[PDB]
Design a protein around this motif. Structure first.
Motif, short mmCIF file in Angstrom:
data_model
loop_
_atom_site.label_atom_id
_atom_site.label_comp_id
_atom_site.label_asym_id
_atom_site.label_seq_id
_atom_site.Cartn_x
_atom_site.Cartn_y
_atom_site.Cartn_z
N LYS A 184 5.59 0.67 8.33
CA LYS A 184 4.94 1.12 9.55
C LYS A 184 4.83 2.64 9.64
O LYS A 184 5.13 3.22 10.69
CB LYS A 184 5.68 0.60 10.78
N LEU A 185 4.40 3.29 8.57
CA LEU A 185 4.37 4.75 8.52
C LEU A 185 2.99 5.21 8.08
O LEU A 185 2.58 4.95 6.95
CB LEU A 185 5.44 5.28 7.57
N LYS A 186 2.28 5.88 8.98
CA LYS A 186 0.90 6.28 8.74
C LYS A 186 0.69 7.75 9.05
O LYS A 186 -0.37 8.16 9.51
CB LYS A 186 -0.06 5.42 9.55
N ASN A 187 1.72 8.56 8.83
CA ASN A 187 1.61 9.98 9.15
C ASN A 187 2.21 10.86 8.06
O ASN A 187 2.30 12.08 8.26
CB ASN A 187 2.29 10.28 10.49
N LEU A 188 2.61 10.30 6.93
CA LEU A 188 3.27 11.10 5.91
C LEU A 188 2.30 12.08 5.28
O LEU A 188 1.14 11.75 5.01
CB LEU A 188 3.88 10.21 4.84
N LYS A 189 2.78 13.30 5.06
CA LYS A 189 2.08 14.28 4.26
C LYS A 189 2.92 14.83 3.13
O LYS A 189 2.36 15.41 2.19
CB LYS A 189 1.61 15.45 5.14
N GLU A 190 4.23 14.66 3.18
CA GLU A 190 5.15 15.15 2.17
C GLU A 190 6.16 14.07 1.83
O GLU A 190 6.31 13.08 2.55
CB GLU A 190 5.87 16.41 2.65
N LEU A 191 6.85 14.28 0.72
CA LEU A 191 7.90 13.37 0.29
C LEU A 191 8.71 14.08 -0.79
O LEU A 191 8.14 14.53 -1.78
CB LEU A 191 7.32 12.08 -0.23
N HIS A 192 10.02 14.17 -0.60
CA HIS A 192 10.87 14.98 -1.46
C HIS A 192 12.06 14.15 -1.90
O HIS A 192 12.96 13.87 -1.11
CB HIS A 192 11.31 16.25 -0.73
N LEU A 193 12.07 13.79 -3.18
CA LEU A 193 13.07 12.91 -3.77
C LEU A 193 13.67 13.55 -5.01
O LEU A 193 14.01 12.87 -5.98
CB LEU A 193 12.47 11.55 -4.09
N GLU A 194 13.81 14.87 -4.99
CA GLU A 194 14.21 15.65 -6.15
C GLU A 194 15.60 15.29 -6.64
O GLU A 194 16.59 15.55 -5.95
CB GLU A 194 14.15 17.14 -5.83
N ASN A 195 15.68 14.70 -7.83
CA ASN A 195 16.95 14.36 -8.47
C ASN A 195 17.76 13.40 -7.60
O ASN A 195 18.86 13.71 -7.14
CB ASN A 195 17.74 15.62 -8.80
N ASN A 196 17.19 12.22 -7.38
CA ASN A 196 17.79 11.25 -6.48
C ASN A 196 18.32 10.02 -7.20
O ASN A 196 18.67 9.04 -6.54
CB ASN A 196 16.79 10.84 -5.41
N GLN A 197 18.42 10.06 -8.53
CA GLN A 197 18.93 8.94 -9.33
C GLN A 197 18.03 7.71 -9.23
O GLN A 197 18.50 6.58 -9.23
CB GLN A 197 20.37 8.58 -8.93
N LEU A 198 16.73 7.94 -9.15
CA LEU A 198 15.78 6.84 -9.16
C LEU A 198 15.64 6.25 -10.55
O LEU A 198 15.93 6.90 -11.56
CB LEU A 198 14.42 7.30 -8.65
N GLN A 199 15.22 5.00 -10.61
CA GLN A 199 14.99 4.34 -11.89
C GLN A 199 13.58 3.81 -12.05
O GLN A 199 13.04 3.85 -13.15
CB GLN A 199 15.97 3.18 -12.08
N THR A 200 12.96 3.33 -10.97
CA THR A 200 11.62 2.77 -11.05
C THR A 200 10.98 2.85 -9.67
O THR A 200 11.61 3.28 -8.70
CB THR A 200 11.64 1.32 -11.53
#
Ligand SMILES: *[C@@H]1O[C@H](CO)[C@@H](O[C@@H]2O[C@H](CO)[C@@H](O[C@@H]3O[C@H](CO)[C@@H](O)[C@H](O)[C@@H]3O)[C@H](O)[C@H]2NC(C)=O)[C@H](O)[C@H]1NC(C)=O
Ligand SMILES: *[C@@H]1O[C@H](CO)[C@@H](O[C@@H]2O[C@H](CO)[C@@H](O[C@@H]3O[C@H](CO)[C@@H](O)[C@H](O)[C@@H]3O)[C@H](O)[C@H]2NC(C)=O)[C@H](O)[C@H]1NC(C)=O
Ligand SMILES: *[C@@H]1O[C@H](CO)[C@@H](O[C@@H]2O[C@H](CO)[C@@H](O[C@@H]3O[C@H](CO)[C@@H](O)[C@H](O)[C@@H]3O)[C@H](O)[C@H]2NC(C)=O)[C@H](O)[C@H]1NC(C)=O
Ligand SMILES: *[C@@H]1O[C@H](CO)[C@@H](O[C@@H]2O[C@H](CO)[C@@H](O[C@@H]3O[C@H](CO)[C@@H](O)[C@H](O)[C@@H]3O)[C@H](O)[C@H]2NC(C)=O)[C@H](O)[C@H]1NC(C)=O
Ligand SMILES: *[C@@H]1O[C@H](CO)[C@@H](O[C@@H]2O[C@H](CO)[C@@H](O[C@@H]3O[C@H](CO)[C@@H](O)[C@H](O)[C@@H]3O)[C@H](O)[C@H]2NC(C)=O)[C@H](O)[C@H]1NC(C)=O
Ligand SMILES: *[C@@H]1O[C@H](CO)[C@@H](O[C@@H]2O[C@H](CO)[C@@H](O)[C@H](O)[C@H]2NC(C)=O)[C@H](O)[C@H]1NC(C)=O
Ligand SMILES: *[C@@H]1O[C@H](CO)[C@@H](O[C@@H]2O[C@H](CO)[C@@H](O)[C@H](O)[C@H]2NC(C)=O)[C@H](O)[C@H]1NC(C)=O
Ligand SMILES: *[C@@H]1O[C@H](CO)[C@@H](O)[C@H](O)[C@H]1NC(C)=O
Ligand SMILES: *[C@@H]1O[C@H](CO)[C@@H](O)[C@H](O)[C@H]1NC(C)=O
Ligand SMILES: *[C@@H]1O[C@H](CO)[C@@H](O)[C@H](O)[C@H]1NC(C)=O
Lengths: 754, 92, 752, 99
Positions: free
Chosen positions: C377-393
């Motif tokens: 339910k999110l329709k206003n994003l312009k940025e997203l910051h996930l720098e070095n967050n231990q993501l895999q996929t």
């Protein structure tokens, strides 16, 4: 929270497709006819693109209470609640509903929406038949209501059931004319628009509850006249927009009560050539207004009064003829004005100076010919002017006094002669700069002077203005490049297209400013590359680095005979021979083409007038500017040569078409090396030739042709020695002994002479 | 519909339609909804319906587009099950 | 006015050159004090001597003007300020400033006679031992500031002046507090206590402040509080807490006030825990920051009852896990940031509670993975910051409900991401990789400068037409092709330090007009020649194109001959490689069979035996070019095979060998380069003169190391070499066996 | 006849990496041609907002087209599904003014 389809496997049809986007669904599987899309509790967009997809057999779907519902041409029950019809959907409290049908127009009553009353944005389209105030009566706190493309007519009392509603708009409703009180019961109508409805005409009785009105828009409503107070009946309106309407004239003072009007737009008001005087007077305030594309014939002396100053007030394409000075009097300020495409030979100046503050102004496409000085002297605030496509040929000496800080000007399709002396009146008063108003223009961002009688280029402008980056010149009367023009130390871009440029005078302009990208265009400029272009020819010949950039492919040198329609790629810089070629002393049968790069003059004769051609005037060094020389006698029988080599300043001989009958080393020049010596006859030789033979001056190349040679003992050994140095001999076999004809190596001389 | 002309959006699973003259590749073994395309169809008599808010010589028209493939489905002769020569948007 | 005083017998003056201002050197009887005066700015003077002696100064009163003296110029104790005003008398200016540096005075009411009405007041380094007397005459007072000072305050000292709008007490190192010090002041809404050491917050210490709106605790070593402190101050608007070594708040601390708009809790590492429902129903609350606070874990019930929050900031805080009941009460939120926090798994059913969130920053968290349901339910994003967050996929349907996105800062990735194939099964479709990026239509900015990107996805130049900037440096992209470039937008690209081994560029570069694309290629293990010649000339001697290449710090890797060589100085004429695996070469030598710049090349100079067949295995030149070269030199062949049917070659080499004769059949006429140098030629090769022919290719015979027999028989050899000496690459090496000398120097008479 | 919102159609070459054919041999042989894919976008004047000579609308927008490329779930492990998009066409859409 989450929603899922109850029994997706209940029927082969009615397959469910759930994604985070929306729980997509449709009953026919491979070729769906009904369609349903609900995203999450907020919007249920669905359609029934065909009648057989009957909702009767549709399975019940646990639709949650969404806030928006859209129905697209789905079959609708008859005189029944929409919710009752869609019992298979369980949206409890929808806030906004939409409806649009490609067919099945339906009479509308309350019973269709008896369950749907807690709603705000209702909208029907393409199927409205009749209202009869039944449906709209049973609604509460409606926010927006809209009808569209229904070709319907209404009773005046229909809307009066609901007194308050924020917005209402009708488009393509096909109403013949507004009933006197059609929307009588309006209290909260902030803005109403009737864009597309061929209304017959307007009556003041149709306008009620005007207090709520703030905006009103009209698009194509084919009206012709208006009541004397239909719009004067109110003032609460803030914005008014009427366009594309066939009304020929207006009542005067139709807005005097409407003193609270902010913005008016009246564009493409066809059949409207005249306006009533004082109609816009007493307008105590107004944000903006435009009246363009209306073709208004003439205007009152001062239509507008009471307003402290407006912004646009444009009247372009209204082909105005006379501009009374009495307007703008109520307006001490105004930002921007446009009056293009108006039959104006000259503005009465004092009308213009009435205002002082001003942004960009446009007067182009007008029949402007004269420009009075006293139109801008007090015009302190001013931006670019758009005055091209006007019959302009003269300008005042200094007219930018109000705004010396002007940025751009576009004088095109005018006839500004603008000769050097055209401005400069007192010759000794001004030397570097003519009295062009460029001195006032301390800056000029962009200038557009293409398509004008540009007789003279003014380098002073580079000093008159120091902020110049893109110069637009085409169809101009400049004879050629001007000296010392690159000296601006900025990235000027220039165009020379379709301009009578014949010679480049830029060697005096040869000066590179750091961090500068100068640009010129070379198009349809009749260059005479014969003379005074060799330095420029080589400069443009693989210009590895230069602050100036060119457009050479658009050009092709034509004026020189051989260099006809010759672009640079065709052109070879080594063949550039200066055009004058007139030492005033060369023989009439001869020609003298001085080569700039070689510092020599091509002494090429013609006509073969006589075998004994006397020596050319070699000592004439062309005002000592060309010491080295080259003798290229063309198409001439030769027997007379320079005895004792009185002219050692030459290393090239031609002897073309010669009928030679003699030889003498003293007659042979010493410094002469590159001698063709065609059409030979020598069957003998003098041993002193080698003593004279010394290629120090240059390569002593010789090409004996048509030569009758008698091979005998003294000449044979001499030919052996010369063949040892045959590097300067065109061909060994050119000897070709006239009696026999053979190779010098083959023959032995002891048998010949023992 | 803030657009120019009314249109129909459908997601049919086509059975036989080819860029060439042979759709037999797709007439056999397509019974598990292998493919589905949101085909847009213009309003009936699009030519007879010039765009609203305008009277240009160019009325609403429907063009086409293609989608080839190399994917291996569950049938023998499937050089490309993706459909080609498919109708496209409707505009003036 | 009197900006330049007159000069006269009683006291001269000298107006320094300043308009409406003047360096008042008016006394000028000794450079003892230098004055600087404007119309209303300042009258402070460089009183070099500590004893000013204003009596010995021109005493030029100009009336009440806002200019004053604050620096170094003092007066003796127990004296009314009028005595200090001796040089200039004023009538109760509303602006008085003074900064005592040398000492600190009691600042007596008796000392303060001459200036009573005031609005702006400043004290500095003093105010020690002052009674409740000086405030009596200072009516209509609004501003008061205290610089670095030191004095405990008697309670209710400033009861006379309740009108003070602003208060300044910073740098005083305020030791303690008393509930009643400020109760005689109501108009005081501005207040700051930074650079103080208030140990504990006394219960209702701020009582008697009817209109207090601003509160600034910035440098305040505080560890103990009380709800009673803020109980009475419901009118407070915005509060700031900074640098206070408290561990936790008391419960019910803040619910008392209502119009709390902004709260700042920065830099409290000792602060580890928060009371439940700290922000109990304060709709006024809009911005709350807790950055750089050692908060252990967030209690669930903290922000219930308040929905007006716009900025929620946590900063570098030790919080670990988030209860879902944190967006529940806040349907409207604009910015959320959780940076450098030990959070490792965002609860999925969290972000549905808000729609209007615009940004998000989860930098350096431990986000092992992300659920698809987060972005419902999110329709206003312009940025997203996930720098070095231990993501895999990335879940495939991650951006289904987030179309309004514009920029992603995935950035440095202390993690891995398999960027090769989301869907590559037998059922997969080659139309476009089904990456979640296809939904992000308006996406413009994306960075992955650290991730384990397997390769590039097509949809970026297909389904993302708004792409502007992209980085893939220090990633794992093996190769690159032109089909991965059709972006149709001015896009800068950073692929340096990636494992780019080879690239494939078609010679016919097709570009959209004004498509300025800039790509960074440095420190990439680039193989060279192979399919790179078109690229090589594209970059080497690049004239002008919409493609730009940061290749300064790049170097060839694979070709051992061109090891670490700069590309710009390198040219295709140096480039050749072989990957057709054909066994054409005899392998007894170097036996080139490569395609040296669209030209088959053979180099059998590898110790070719004498009379070794020149072309034992000639190339069919299939799918290639018939231009062929043979290199058999440095090899002892005192006699070459001199027998070879016409073969499509243009170049031959034979050095450190010798020859006795030649066959016309052996020599094709399409030959351009024949070496025949460094090889002895004693005998007269008569047949060659017969085979001397005007060959099609540009003959360049370098006949050298020849010692012929200069004599009458076939003496026309000199004529042959002299008629076209340009063809003869060398004549000096022709040095006959009897007399070793260049044949040109020997004439026919010498010959015969 | 010209239409509203002139748009540019493009044949994008399919993936020519070919599983990095330079993995084991580095001599290119990819000189052939394939049908490619046709995509049209309206970048006329970088999407010139007034889309028609007729005007009356100063905004046209490119439109994708999502295609349900799979519902077979032939993997025999899961109901594999997928939606694929591409900017199939561009069209003019009128806006609603404030007034
Ligand atoms: C029913 O009609 C009302 C208007 O009478 C709709 O309210 C308006 O809704 C639109 C979009 O839904 C809002 O537009 C947005 O406004 C914000 C405000 O800053 C702006 O930043 C956005 O860019 C966008 O333009 C509009 O503001 C809103 N009206 C007011 C006064 O806020 C209502 O949405 C309609 N019903 C439904 C279910 O949409
Ligand atoms: C027209 O009136 C207002 C907007 O102008 C809409 O709200 C309605 O306002 C009236 C008051 O004039 C309400 O009547 C009374 O309201 C009070 C407090 O709300 C309530 O306690 C009473 O029992 C009585 O209902 C009315 O309820 C209220 N209705 C709604 C849905 O908000 C009104 O809807 C507009 N339209 C109509 C047809 O009244
Ligand atoms: C110097 O003056 C002599 C005049 O004697 C010039 O000779 C003329 O050169 C032109 C070159 O275009 C000749 O025209 C062409 O001649 C060739 C010769 O085969 C012919 O094939 C063409 O159709 C064309 O007619 C011209 O005949 C010739 N005339 C004479 C009397 O010599 C010479 O060109 C001058 N040197 C220059 C301009 O550098
Ligand atoms: C005591 O100090 C206060 C410090 O705020 C003074 O209040 C403000 O002082 C400024 C100039 O000293 C007044 O002018 C303002 O200037 C700014 C910057 O040019 C401008 O943006 C404002 O529009 C205004 O012109 C300002 O009105 C005043 N009050 C405020 C900001 O609320 C006060 O004047 C000082 N009083 C004495 C007696 O020294
Ligand atoms: C991408 O980089 C290119 C550089 O190659 C930028 O070039 C600009 O491209 C636009 C049109 O694509 C040019 O506008 C038009 O230019 C022509 C000729 O210059 C002119 O006659 C037209 O009136 C119009 O101004 C622009 O001049 C050009 N600027 C340059 C070459 O400096 C482009 O802006 C960048 N951005 C994009 C989205 O392409
Ligand atoms: C605080 O300000 C008020 C006014 O805002 C002051 O009250 C005024 O005092 C003067 C003193 O003679 C009277 O002439 C006015 O009539 C009073 N006005 C009002 C509205 O009370 C009050 O004295 C100030 N308090 C101080 C300076 O401590
Ligand atoms: C680039 O990525 C690498 C690994 O992908 C980072 O190197 C290490 O990554 C491990 C991952 O568990 C960390 O524990 C180490 O702390 C990292 N080492 C360093 C020195 O940071 C590397 O940090 C990344 N570089 C950048 C600039 O993002
Ligand atoms: C230049 O202006 C004249 C003025 O009438 C016009 O006829 C012509 O079309 C314009 N353009 C050119 C290229 O001459
Ligand atoms: C003009 O162009 C040059 C390069 O030719 C550049 O260095 C310089 O910065 C440009 N001028 C300005 C003002 O930027
Ligand atoms: C000179 O005369 C000869 C004799 O006919 C002729 O062949 C030759 O072409 C002539 N040369 C020129 C330049 O006319």
């Amino acid at each position: 929270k989450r929603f899922t389809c109850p029994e997706e496997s209940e029927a082969s049809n009615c397959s469910c497709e759930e994604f985070p986007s929306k729980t997509h669904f449709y009953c026919p599987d491979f070729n769906p006819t009904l369609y349903v899309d609900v995203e999450d509790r907020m919007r249920v967009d669905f359609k029934c693109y065909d009648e057989p997809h009957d909702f009767k057999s549709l399975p019940n779907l646990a639709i949650g209470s969404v806030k928006l519902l859209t129905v697209v041409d789905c079959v609708l029950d008859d005189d029944r609640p929409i919710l009752e019809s869609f019992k298979f959907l369980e949206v409890a409290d929808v806030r906004s509903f939409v409806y649009n049908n490609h067919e099945n127009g339906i009479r509308y009553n309350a019973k269709y929406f008896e369950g749907m009353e807690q709603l705000e944005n209702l909208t029907l389209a393409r199927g409205v038949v009749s209202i009869d105030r039944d449906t709209f009566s049973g609604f509460l706190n409606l926010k927006r209501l809209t009808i569209e493309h229904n070709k319907l007519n209404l009773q005046p009392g229909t809307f009066e059931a609901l007194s308050n509603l924020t917005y209402l708009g009708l488009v393509y409703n096909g109403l013949n004319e507004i009933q006197p009180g059609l929307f009588d019961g309006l209290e909260s109508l902030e803005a109403l628009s009737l864009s597309y409805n061929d209304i017959k005409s307007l009556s003041a009785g149709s306008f009620n509850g005007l207090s709520s009105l703030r905006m009103l828009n009209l698009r194509v409503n084919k009206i012709e006249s208006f009541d004397a107070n239909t719009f004067a009946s109110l003032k609460e309106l803030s914005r008014l927009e009427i366009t594309l309407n066939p009304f020929v004239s207006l009542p005067r003072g139709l807005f005097s009560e409407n003193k609270k009007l902010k913005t008016l737009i009246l564009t493409n008001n066809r059949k409207l050539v005249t306006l009533p005087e004082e109609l816009l007077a007493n307008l105590k305030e107004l944000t903006v207004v435009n009246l363009s594309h209306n073709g208004v014939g003439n205007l009152p002396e001062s239509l507008l009064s009471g307003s402290s100053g407006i912004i646009e007030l444009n009247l372009g394409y209204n082909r105005l003829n006379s501009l009374p000075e009495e307007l703008l009097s109520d307006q001490p300020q105004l930002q921007v004005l446009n009056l293009d495409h108006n039959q104006l030979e000259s503005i009465p100046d004092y009308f213009l100076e009435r205002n002082v503050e001003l942004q960009t102004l446009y007067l182009s496409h007008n029949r402007l010919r004269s420009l009075s000085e006293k139109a801008f002297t007090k015009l302190k605030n001013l931006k670019e002017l758009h005055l091209e496509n006007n019959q302009l040929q003269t300008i005042p000496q200094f007219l930018f006094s109000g705004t010396p800080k002007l940025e751009e000007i576009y004088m095109q399709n005018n006839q500004l002669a603008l000769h050097a002396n055209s401005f400069i009146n007192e010759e000794l008063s001004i030397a570097d700069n003519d009295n062009t108003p460029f001195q006032v223009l301390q800056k000029l961002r962009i200038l557009h002077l293409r398509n004008n009688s540009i007789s003279t280029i003014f380098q002073d402008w580079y000093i008159n203005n120091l902020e110049m980056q893109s110069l637009d010149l085409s169809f101009n009367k400049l004879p050629g490049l001007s000296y010392t023009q690159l000296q601006f130390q900025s990235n000027i871009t220039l165009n020379l297209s379709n301009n009578e440029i014949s010679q480049v005078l830029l060697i005096d302009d040869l000066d590179l400013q750091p961090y500068q990208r100068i640009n010129v265009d070379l198009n349809h400029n009749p260059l005479n590359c014969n003379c005074n272009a060799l330095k420029f020819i080589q400069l443009i010949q693989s210009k590895a680095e230069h602050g100036l950039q060119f457009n050479v492919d658009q050009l092709r040198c034509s004026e020189p005979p051989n260099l006809l329609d010759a672009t640079m790629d065709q052109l070879q810089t080594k063949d550039l021979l200066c055009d004058f070629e007139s030492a005033d002393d060369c023989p009439k049968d001869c020609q003298c083409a001085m080569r700039l790069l070689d510092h020599t003059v091509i002494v090429n004769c013609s006509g073969r007038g006589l075998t004994e051609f006397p020596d050319l005037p070699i000592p004439s060094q062309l005002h000592e500017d060309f010491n080295a020389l080259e003798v290229h006698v063309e198409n001439n029988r030769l027997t007379k040569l320079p005895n004792l080599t009185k002219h050692n300043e030459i290393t090239q001989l031609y002897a073309r078409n010669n009928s030679i009958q003699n030889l003498l080393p003293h007659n042979i020049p010493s410094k002469l090396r590159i001698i063709d010596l065609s059409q030979n006859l020598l069957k003998m030789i003098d041993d002193s030739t080698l003593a004279q033979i010394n290629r120090s001056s240059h390569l002593e190349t010789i090409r004996l042709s048509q030569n009758q040679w008698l091979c005998d003992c003294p000449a044979s050994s001499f030919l052996i020695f010369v063949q040892q140095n045959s590097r300067l001999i065109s061909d060994m076999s050119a000897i070709r002994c006239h009696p026999s004809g053979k190779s010098l190596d083959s023959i032995t001389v002891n048998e010949l002479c023992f | 519909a803030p657009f120019l002309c009314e249109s129909e959006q459908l997601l049919i699973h086509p059975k036989e339609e080819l860029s060439r003259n042979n759709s037999m590749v797709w007439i056999v073994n397509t019974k598990d909804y292998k493919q589905g395309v949101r085909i847009e169809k213009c309003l009936k008599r699009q030519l007879g319906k010039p765009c609203n808010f305008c009277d240009a010589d160019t009325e609403c028209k429907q063009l086409f587009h293609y989608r080839t493939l190399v994917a291996v489905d569950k049938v023998t002769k499937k050089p490309y099950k993706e459909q080609v020569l498919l109708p496209s948007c409707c505009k003036c």
